[PDB]
Design a protein around this motif. Structure first.
Motif, PDB file in Angstrom:
ATOM      1  N   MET A  28       0.818  -1.206   0.000  1.00  0.00           N
ATOM      2  CA  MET A  28       0.000   0.000   0.000  1.00  0.00           C
ATOM      3  C   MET A  28       0.853   1.258   0.000  1.00  0.00           C
ATOM      4  O   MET A  28       0.498   2.244  -0.655  1.00  0.00           O
ATOM      5  CB  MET A  28      -0.931   0.005   1.211  1.00  0.00           C
ATOM      6  CG  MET A  28      -1.961   1.117   1.198  1.00  0.00           C
ATOM      7  SD  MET A  28      -2.417   1.608  -0.472  1.00  0.00           S
ATOM      8  CE  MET A  28      -3.891   2.564  -0.151  1.00  0.00           C
ATOM      9  N   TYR A  29       1.987   1.240   0.705  1.00  0.00           N
ATOM     10  CA  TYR A  29       2.813   2.441   0.765  1.00  0.00           C
ATOM     11  C   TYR A  29       3.252   2.876  -0.626  1.00  0.00           C
ATOM     12  O   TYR A  29       3.344   4.079  -0.896  1.00  0.00           O
ATOM     13  CB  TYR A  29       4.018   2.214   1.685  1.00  0.00           C
ATOM     14  CG  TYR A  29       5.324   1.883   0.993  1.00  0.00           C
ATOM     15  CD1 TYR A  29       6.167   2.885   0.533  1.00  0.00           C
ATOM     16  CD2 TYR A  29       5.720   0.566   0.813  1.00  0.00           C
ATOM     17  CE1 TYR A  29       7.356   2.583  -0.096  1.00  0.00           C
ATOM     18  CE2 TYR A  29       6.908   0.257   0.188  1.00  0.00           C
ATOM     19  CZ  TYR A  29       7.721   1.266  -0.265  1.00  0.00           C
ATOM     20  OH  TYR A  29       8.906   0.960  -0.889  1.00  0.00           O
ATOM     21  N   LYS A  30       3.475   1.923  -1.534  1.00  0.00           N
ATOM     22  CA  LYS A  30       3.874   2.279  -2.891  1.00  0.00           C
ATOM     23  C   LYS A  30       2.829   3.166  -3.551  1.00  0.00           C
ATOM     24  O   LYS A  30       3.170   4.113  -4.267  1.00  0.00           O
ATOM     25  CB  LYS A  30       4.111   1.018  -3.723  1.00  0.00           C
ATOM     26  CG  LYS A  30       4.366   1.283  -5.206  1.00  0.00           C
ATOM     27  CD  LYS A  30       4.022   0.079  -6.079  1.00  0.00           C
ATOM     28  CE  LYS A  30       3.835   0.482  -7.537  1.00  0.00           C
ATOM     29  NZ  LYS A  30       2.882   1.616  -7.688  1.00  0.00           N
ATOM     30  N   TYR A  31       1.548   2.882  -3.316  1.00  0.00           N
ATOM     31  CA  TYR A  31       0.494   3.712  -3.886  1.00  0.00           C
ATOM     32  C   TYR A  31       0.334   5.019  -3.129  1.00  0.00           C
ATOM     33  O   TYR A  31      -0.146   6.004  -3.696  1.00  0.00           O
ATOM     34  CB  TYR A  31      -0.838   2.960  -3.901  1.00  0.00           C
ATOM     35  CG  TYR A  31      -0.804   1.642  -4.635  1.00  0.00           C
ATOM     36  CD1 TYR A  31      -0.184   0.533  -4.084  1.00  0.00           C
ATOM     37  CD2 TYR A  31      -1.385   1.508  -5.882  1.00  0.00           C
ATOM     38  CE1 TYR A  31      -0.145  -0.663  -4.748  1.00  0.00           C
ATOM     39  CE2 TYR A  31      -1.354   0.312  -6.554  1.00  0.00           C
ATOM     40  CZ  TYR A  31      -0.730  -0.770  -5.982  1.00  0.00           C
ATOM     41  OH  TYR A  31      -0.692  -1.971  -6.645  1.00  0.00           O
ATOM     42  N   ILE A  32       0.732   5.047  -1.857  1.00  0.00           N
ATOM     43  CA  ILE A  32       0.511   6.228  -1.028  1.00  0.00           C
ATOM     44  C   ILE A  32       1.326   7.396  -1.556  1.00  0.00           C
ATOM     45  O   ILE A  32       0.842   8.530  -1.647  1.00  0.00           O
ATOM     46  CB  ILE A  32       0.865   5.905   0.431  1.00  0.00           C
ATOM     47  CG1 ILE A  32      -0.339   5.313   1.145  1.00  0.00           C
ATOM     48  CG2 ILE A  32       1.284   7.160   1.160  1.00  0.00           C
ATOM     49  CD1 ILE A  32      -0.018   4.849   2.530  1.00  0.00           C
ATOM     50  N   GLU A  33       2.576   7.129  -1.922  1.00  0.00           N
ATOM     51  CA  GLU A  33       3.504   8.113  -2.470  1.00  0.00           C
ATOM     52  C   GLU A  33       3.845   7.637  -3.876  1.00  0.00           C
ATOM     53  O   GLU A  33       4.468   6.585  -4.035  1.00  0.00           O
ATOM     54  CB  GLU A  33       4.737   8.220  -1.588  1.00  0.00           C
ATOM     55  CG  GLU A  33       5.096   6.895  -0.943  1.00  0.00           C
ATOM     56  CD  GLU A  33       5.943   7.055   0.296  1.00  0.00           C
ATOM     57  OE1 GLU A  33       6.424   8.176   0.544  1.00  0.00           O
ATOM     58  OE2 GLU A  33       6.126   6.060   1.025  1.00  0.00           O
ATOM     59  N   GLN A  34       3.424   8.394  -4.888  1.00  0.00           N
ATOM     60  CA  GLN A  34       3.484   7.915  -6.264  1.00  0.00           C
ATOM     61  C   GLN A  34       4.886   7.457  -6.622  1.00  0.00           C
ATOM     62  O   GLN A  34       5.811   8.265  -6.720  1.00  0.00           O
ATOM     63  CB  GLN A  34       3.028   9.015  -7.219  1.00  0.00           C
ATOM     64  CG  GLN A  34       1.614   9.489  -6.975  1.00  0.00           C
ATOM     65  CD  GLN A  34       1.192  10.569  -7.942  1.00  0.00           C
ATOM     66  OE1 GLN A  34       0.098  11.119  -7.837  1.00  0.00           O
ATOM     67  NE2 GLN A  34       2.059  10.880  -8.894  1.00  0.00           N
ATOM     68  N   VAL A  35       5.035   6.153  -6.824  1.00  0.00           N
ATOM     69  CA  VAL A  35       6.319   5.525  -7.101  1.00  0.00           C
ATOM     70  C   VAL A  35       6.290   5.000  -8.525  1.00  0.00           C
ATOM     71  O   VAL A  35       5.356   4.288  -8.907  1.00  0.00           O
ATOM     72  CB  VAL A  35       6.618   4.391  -6.105  1.00  0.00           C
ATOM     73  CG1 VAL A  35       7.624   3.427  -6.688  1.00  0.00           C
ATOM     74  CG2 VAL A  35       7.139   4.959  -4.805  1.00  0.00           C
ATOM     75  N   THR A  36       7.303   5.357  -9.309  1.00  0.00           N
ATOM     76  CA  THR A  36       7.430   4.899 -10.686  1.00  0.00           C
ATOM     77  C   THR A  36       8.730   4.125 -10.826  1.00  0.00           C
ATOM     78  O   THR A  36       9.813   4.708 -10.722  1.00  0.00           O
ATOM     79  CB  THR A  36       7.408   6.073 -11.664  1.00  0.00           C
ATOM     80  OG1 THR A  36       8.652   6.775 -11.586  1.00  0.00           O
ATOM     81  CG2 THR A  36       6.285   7.029 -11.315  1.00  0.00           C
ATOM     82  N   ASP A  37       8.623   2.824 -11.063  1.00  0.00           N
ATOM     83  CA  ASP A  37       9.783   1.978 -11.309  1.00  0.00           C
ATOM     84  C   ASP A  37      10.032   1.923 -12.807  1.00  0.00           C
ATOM     85  O   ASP A  37       9.139   1.550 -13.575  1.00  0.00           O
ATOM     86  CB  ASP A  37       9.573   0.571 -10.754  1.00  0.00           C
ATOM     87  CG  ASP A  37       9.386   0.562  -9.259  1.00  0.00           C
ATOM     88  OD1 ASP A  37       9.426   1.652  -8.657  1.00  0.00           O
ATOM     89  OD2 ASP A  37       9.202  -0.530  -8.685  1.00  0.00           O
ATOM     90  N   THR A  38      11.237   2.292 -13.220  1.00  0.00           N
ATOM     91  CA  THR A  38      11.611   2.306 -14.622  1.00  0.00           C
ATOM     92  C   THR A  38      12.839   1.430 -14.819  1.00  0.00           C
ATOM     93  O   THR A  38      13.796   1.509 -14.045  1.00  0.00           O
ATOM     94  CB  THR A  38      11.892   3.734 -15.098  1.00  0.00           C
ATOM     95  OG1 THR A  38      10.656   4.445 -15.229  1.00  0.00           O
ATOM     96  CG2 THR A  38      12.602   3.729 -16.440  1.00  0.00           C
ATOM     97  N   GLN A  39      12.800   0.586 -15.845  1.00  0.00           N
ATOM     98  CA  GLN A  39      13.937  -0.240 -16.215  1.00  0.00           C
ATOM     99  C   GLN A  39      14.264  -0.016 -17.681  1.00  0.00           C
ATOM    100  O   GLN A  39      13.513   0.637 -18.409  1.00  0.00           O
ATOM    101  CB  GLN A  39      13.671  -1.724 -15.977  1.00  0.00           C
ATOM    102  CG  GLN A  39      13.857  -2.175 -14.551  1.00  0.00           C
ATOM    103  CD  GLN A  39      13.668  -3.667 -14.400  1.00  0.00           C
ATOM    104  OE1 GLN A  39      13.319  -4.357 -15.356  1.00  0.00           O
ATOM    105  NE2 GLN A  39      13.889  -4.175 -13.193  1.00  0.00           N
ATOM    106  N   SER A  40      15.401  -0.558 -18.104  1.00  0.00           N
ATOM    107  CA  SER A  40      15.801  -0.508 -19.500  1.00  0.00           C
ATOM    108  C   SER A  40      16.904  -1.527 -19.724  1.00  0.00           C
ATOM    109  O   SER A  40      17.489  -2.055 -18.777  1.00  0.00           O
ATOM    110  CB  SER A  40      16.277   0.890 -19.908  1.00  0.00           C
ATOM    111  OG  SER A  40      15.179   1.762 -20.101  1.00  0.00           O
TER     112      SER A  40
END
Lengths: 38, 55
Positions: free
Chosen positions: B5-17
């Motif tokens: 839930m904490y991931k949604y609480i503070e907008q978290v964007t995981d980016t890979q490449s």
């Protein structure tokens, strides 16, 4: 200059003298030319 | 519920490449050379020397 004195005893004393003087002068001139073409 | 839930609480964007590159370069060089030299020489000379002596 050269002098020599000879004597013998048992009286036929021998004394000699001779003068040698000589001078030489020489003048030589030359000239060389060359052309090159490459 | 749970921790996620904490991931949604503070907008978290995981980016890979991932970039995978390949490169082959082939070079062929040929060279020819032709030279020609032609020379000419000529030299001439004269000399005179006179010697006079007295003794």
């Amino acid at each position: 200059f050269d002098d020599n004195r000879t004597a013998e005893s048992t009286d036929t004393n021998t004394i000699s003298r001779d003068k040698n003087t000589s001078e030489t002068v020489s003048e030589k001139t030359g000239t060389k030319d060359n052309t090159f073409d490459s | 519920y749970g921790s996620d839930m904490y991931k949604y609480i503070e907008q978290v964007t995981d980016t890979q490449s991932q970039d995978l590159g390949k490169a082959i370069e082939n070079a062929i060089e040929q060279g020819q050379t032709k030279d020609r030299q032609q020379d000419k020489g000529h030299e001439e000379y004269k000399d005179y020397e006179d010697t006079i002596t007295k003794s």
